């Protein structure tokens, strides 16, 4: 039996005698190892809870408590996607214990000091292929944000995603120094000029001969808080302010691999926010692309600063002309208080979109709750000195922050915004198919989103 | 195999294809199921470690490890003990493999809205015996430190002491009211005047036919801080101030089961530190059994201010003579921050009665490191108003508390004191034999220092 | 002898009480230069490239952050009549890096390199004395500053020894700078280090149980322990020795490197001397001391001891010598 089988086991499913010795009462994620009838290798008996009740979800987090659980064995064979009962047709089953199982195998290894094949039994070959592919962009966005800040600079970054552009065939351009400072990203220029690190501007286009969706990541590869220093004593997983942009990479490699008819561009600025001698300062005021003013009333405020001019960028009338924008950042501190650690914010005016992007994110088992672009927190933007403030020092800020990259999205252009701070990033332990810290929060809900919009 | 076997495998040891595909490779406390050879029953294999570095918390954490493992069994027989090839004998073993059963199988369930036997195998009956009940001990002031501090009041533990005292055959008084207010412990009734729940005292006799040692125990059954209230937002485990009385009480219940040759009293000062109309002030000053004073700097330093004057009662020259005084206080919290939440500090001016003390916790495996009482932190003692301070608001306070108990010590009494606020209570995840919340910490290093003394 | 031991406090209650703006790691350096050709001590300082080449990355990483480039200075007593290694911990300012320390609490800042100073100014009475043993003084000397270079919250230094750091807390600087000194001073390699005793300002959890005058001791050499506290005791400092608990290795832990270098939990002393202990070739002895409270006297004069830097451990580092010498 290939070293390790994996058997799916709804509640009320026929397990031997040791298994039931053992307490195996087909618990969702509960494992139980057992040598296979012949004697020559092992059995895992997996949990997938009632049939009724199971969801994609179930059968993704089983994958990746069946990977975890596989010991020194050198294969591994996963049946989990032949258990049949449940509503989640093969296609979906197939699908979700493919990209559990990768998701379950991450690792982060690369700063320290056997398994070699896992093989899903199915013969919904297309779904294991498109769920291997979208783990793998997962992992790769994982990658990004578990790498020391110190390694993946901004500069450092720009280099990796033009290597990832090669790859796949993406169109890339980096700007940087003079060339930079044409494209009048001056909310970019201006936080991250304190660092000794210089800021970089990419743009990937993803453009098969089969609408043109625009995706904007906030890539602030080292957040410090800049002179708003954060406070020394607080945890800030500090080099994870680039979430947003590696959810967009990631999900721009897949496209090529998926096939997928539809115009994709991503636009990433990239930067540290540190403090020095030359940062920007309290009371300084931003003049942005579109001639509009922002008074930076706190320098840990940084994203939305540096987003403003981007988005100007990727919705102005221009050559070509991107029908919809999606923005992506790990932006606010606020959200979390009410939302907690594993669910992103999603704002949009448009209702369509807030739906398909909803939908998107349950078929990624990814948890989003759409919050509300009040007017009435307009207020909270407002400045003594400037069009707007970065920040008003009173509660409500993610919606604020929301309201304020609003003010920067052409009129009439469809918009997303995602604010993924708290899920970006787990800082507890793993569990299901999520590793401690990095998590590629966003990439799968993404990638369905584009799905959906191309068809 | 009586559903479960437990079988102790040191590095090197022979086991099945199976438990080696599985990665079983004897590290301490690693356990993997398998079925029995004749498929009726479960065997599980345990790690030892090598051979040459097993100690007795070896045997003792993979007996814990090994109840975790049980599964829905009815009965298991752990072997761990027969296990030889390390340097820790036959009797040890089946000690510590007694133990370390008890004590993982811990659970403390009384809040919340199929294991009937475990057998340890082994010839050496009498330290199995000797086990258990250091363990049962331990339990019993792991429910005491649990129990919720509105049903472990003052008055109820009192009750509780003498309930115990009474299965025990010890001699058990009951102070209250003008009764307790006629033994002049006015620390005890300073510091317990604040809450509705009135104080007791306690003394607790084991006295067998067969030198006399006095047991002082730290009975705060919740410390809320009183007018110096700890800050909201802050967790502590205000109920488990009561971990040296728990500690005292627990093991002068084990004393009869082992019938040791020594005459050995309880010392119990129980109180409510709380805030109110009428608790206890900051400037305010204790006159003492002694006569002396100490000005109230802090009313968070209440535990040293109730055991002055019971020290004074322990120690005093009169009928039948203490002949060694021993105090157990979850009593500062300065400590954990140089020896951590897992270790805790032993003060004494006898060098031989500090060997006894932490000889006994290295059997036990309880982790304590001797700290000097530096004669240079009296200093930080002095007050303005009265003879000394119960608080410096300066670094040093773990000593200076020590210094402070010290002044209350008859001239020529040997005598130690243990500060166990730290690992009296485990707020991490469980560990080998050690649960989250009330540890029991103290009470086997306790009982292997009176057997020590006995001898 | 007296004389010649006090002396040498007092140049170490200089040195600490000197402002970081002269004594800055270049100065010191110099300083060090000075005092060794005095003493007749031989005396090698590394800087930029030449500092480089040596693989101390420790150092480099938490000193880049400065405008003051750090220094690695090497003393070496080397009589005609065992060779013992003294590596002392020279952060000439640590203002906690990114990981600021809060304003408005005080932190003697310039003392950090109290450790450094104790070394050296033990080194300078050797030839008074005329003590039959070689000793090499190790001196890893930088400014831990906040600045758009500076080494951030998160980034892993690779050590000479091959071993990774996480930096989780960029003001637990000193273990970082330590180790790739303690790698190289235990090394097996030409003539042989027997054994090796650090000094370091290094810990302020320790104070918190201790007090504001003694030094944390840890070894896993008991005959090392009972050498360097009957040393203290000649010498009227105040030690107590710690335990290298091993349950608190635990607290070492990384989700990235080999390590951290700050685990946000109580117990950091010990974890500290548990850090450094890595670095420490198998079976060299070796003794921590931590004396970052006693190194500096925040309260009045006492006794023979003033305000500010103390000199503590210049005289504890000569008896103990002394004893080891016999
Ligand atoms: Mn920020
Ligand atoms: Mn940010
Ligand atoms: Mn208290
Ligand atoms: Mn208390
Ligand atoms: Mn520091
Ligand atoms: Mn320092």
Same mark, same amino acid.
């Given at each position: ?62 994958? #990746?408590?069946?990977? @975890?659980?596989?010991?020194? *064995?050198? %294969?591994?064979? /996963? =049946?989990? !996607?032949?258990?049949? +009962?449940? &509503? ?67 500069? #450092?970054?720009?280099? @990796?995603?033009?290597?990832? *552009?090669? %790859?796949?065939? /993406? =169109?890339? !351009?980096?700007?940087? +120094?003079? &060339? ?81 008819? /539809? ?193």
């Amino acid at each position: 039996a290939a070293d390790v089988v994996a058997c799916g086991r709804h509640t009320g499913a026929a397990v031997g005698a040791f298994s039931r010795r053992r307490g195996f009462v087909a618990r969702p994620g509960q494992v139980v190892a057992e040598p296979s009838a012949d004697g020559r290798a092992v059995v895992l008996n997996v949990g997938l809870g009632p049939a009724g009740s199971a969801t994609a979800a179930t059968f993704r987090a089983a994958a #990746a408590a069946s990977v @975890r659980a596989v010991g020194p *064995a050198r %294969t591994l064979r /996963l =049946d989990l !996607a032949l258990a049949d +009962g449940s &509503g989640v047709p093969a296609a979906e089953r197939a699908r979700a214990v493919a990209e559990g199982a990768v998701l379950g195998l991450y690792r982060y290894d690369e700063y320290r000091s056997p398994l070699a094949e896992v093989i899903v039994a199915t013969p919904e070959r297309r779904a294991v292929a498109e769920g291997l592919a979208a783990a793998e962009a997962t992992c790769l966005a994982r990658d990004l944000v578990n790498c020391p800040a110190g390694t993946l600079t901004p500069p #450092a970054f720009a280099d @990796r995603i033009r290597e990832l *552009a090669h %790859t796949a065939g /993406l =169109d890339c !351009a980096v700007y940087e +120094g003079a &060339g930079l400072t044409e494209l009048g990203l001056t909310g970019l220029t201006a936080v991250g000029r304190g660092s000794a690190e210089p800021p970089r501007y990419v743009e990937l286009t993803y453009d098969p001969p089969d609408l043109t969706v625009g995706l904007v990541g906030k890539g602030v590869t080292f957040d410090s808080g800049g002179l708003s220093l954060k406070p020394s004593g607080e945890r800030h997983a500090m080099k994870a302010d680039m979430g947003g942009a590696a959810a967009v990479v990631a999900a721009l490699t897949a496209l090529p691999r998926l096939g997928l008819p /539809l115009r994709v561009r991503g636009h990433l600025p990239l930067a540290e926010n540190m403090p020095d001698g030359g940062a920007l300062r309290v009371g300084d005021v931003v003049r942005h692309l579109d001639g509009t003013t922002t008074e930076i009333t706190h320098t840990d405020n940084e994203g939305r600063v540096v987003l403003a001019d981007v988005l100007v960028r990727a919705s102005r009338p221009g050559p070509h002309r991107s029908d919809l924008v999606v923005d992506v950042a790990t932006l606010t501190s606020a959200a979390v208080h009410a939302l907690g650690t594993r669910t992103g914010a999603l704002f949009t005016p448009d209702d369509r979109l807030a739906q398909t992007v909803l939908a998107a994110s349950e078929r990624a088992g990814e948890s989003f709750c759409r919050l509300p672009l009040l007017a009435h927190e307009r207020r909270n933007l407002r400045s003594a000195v400037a069009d707007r403030v970065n920040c008003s020092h009173r509660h409500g800020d993610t919606i604020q922050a929301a309201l304020f990259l609003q003010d920067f999205v052409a009129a009439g252009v469809p918009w997303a915004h995602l604010d993924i701070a708290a899920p970006a990033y787990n800082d507890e332990g793993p569990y299901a198919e999520v590793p401690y810290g990095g998590t590629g929060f966003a990439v799968r809900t993404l990638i369905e989103t584009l799905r959906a919009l191309s068809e």
